Amino acid sequence: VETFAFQAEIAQLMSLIINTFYSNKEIFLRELISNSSDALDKIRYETLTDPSKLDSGKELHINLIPNKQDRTLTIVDTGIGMTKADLINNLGTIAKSGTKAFMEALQAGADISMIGQFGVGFYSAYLVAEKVTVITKHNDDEQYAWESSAGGSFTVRTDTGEPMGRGTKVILHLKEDQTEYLEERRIKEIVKKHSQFIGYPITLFVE
Ligand SMILES: Cc1cc(C#Cc2ccccc2CNn2ccoc2=O)nc(N)n1
């Protein structure tokens, strides 16, 4: 297991999301589904010129899986997936400028719900999760497990769990007072309100 430190700017963003009083937490879902949609659009586009890129799975969809026993809400997509390089450097590099812009916008009057317009919506997951685990598999890389409870660091390890073929699984270990996001009617409500026109099937599993 490798332990890495977030760039100061991203750690700052995460603490703001965790510390700022902001009731409209449900927007975290739209941000994650949006990321999944972008990842699906990407593998889709790439397969138009290299069909073999779908040998790891032709289905392009999103699964939303709640589990009360483990108190988790998992967002699963069969998108392009992330490389180890994305996990350690690429994503953080891009998020740096997005965070700055977002920060400046906030002090200018914007609010947390607009985080997605700055390209760093992923971190909104910390509005409802005490810990986030990301299992991902990109075509020319191994399957990895990324994890972070914020606090300034994250870990990456080669994942030996059940292989997923291709895609990303964001596991949200929900905070004790945010279990409403495990309820089918609540998830259904949120998807209908903020993600009704996603161009991929979104299946809401039931417990
Ligand atoms: C390929 C792909 C990418 C994403 C994403 C993202 C994204 C976009 C902007 C800033 C930070 C991130 C993610 N950062 N993450 C997620 C695990 O390790 C990280 O550093 N989400 C999905 N579902 N699929």
CA distance 127 to 122: 10
Resolution stated for this PDB structure, in Å: 1.8
Whether residue 82 contacts residue 91, with contact meaning beta carbons closer than 8 Å, is answered with yes
Smallest CA-to-CA distance from 44 within 34, 59, 30 is with: 59
Q: Which amino acid is at 62?
A: I
Q: Provide the experimental method for this PDB entry.
A: X-ray
- Tokens coding 49: 């010129």
CATH number of 98's domain: 3.30.565.10
Test site for ligand 1: of 28, 82, 115, 118, most ligand atoms within 8 A of the Cβ: 82
Q: Which amino acid is at 194?
A: H
- Ligand 1: residue whose CA is nearest its atom 10: 120
In terms of DSSP H, where are the helices of 24-173?
Answer: 27-47, 84-85, 91-107
Torsion of CA 24, 150, 89, 107, to 10 degrees: 50
Whether residue 122 contacts residue 32, with contact meaning beta carbons closer than 8 Å, is answered with yes
Would you call 7 helix, strand, or coil by DSSP? Answer: coil
Would you call 33 helix, strand, or coil by DSSP? Answer: helix
The residue written with tokens 């297991």 in the block is 1
The residue written with tokens 């409403």 in the block is 180
Domain with 201, as residue range(s), is: 1-207
Smallest CA-to-CA distance from 18 within 122, 190, 150 is with: 150
Partners of 169 in beta bridges:
76, 135
- Please state the domain count of the chain: 1
Would you call 135 helix, strand, or coil by DSSP? Answer: strand
Q: What DSSP string runs through 62-97?
A: EEEEEETTTTEEEEEE-S----HHIIIIIHHHHHHH
Q: Which run of H or E residues covers position 4?
A: strand 2-5
Test site for ligand 1: of 35, 134, 159, 171, most ligand atoms within 8 A of the Cβ: 35
Ligand 1, pocket residues at CB < 6 Å: 35-36, 39, 77, 79-82, 87, 91-92, 95, 119-120, 122, 134, 146, 168
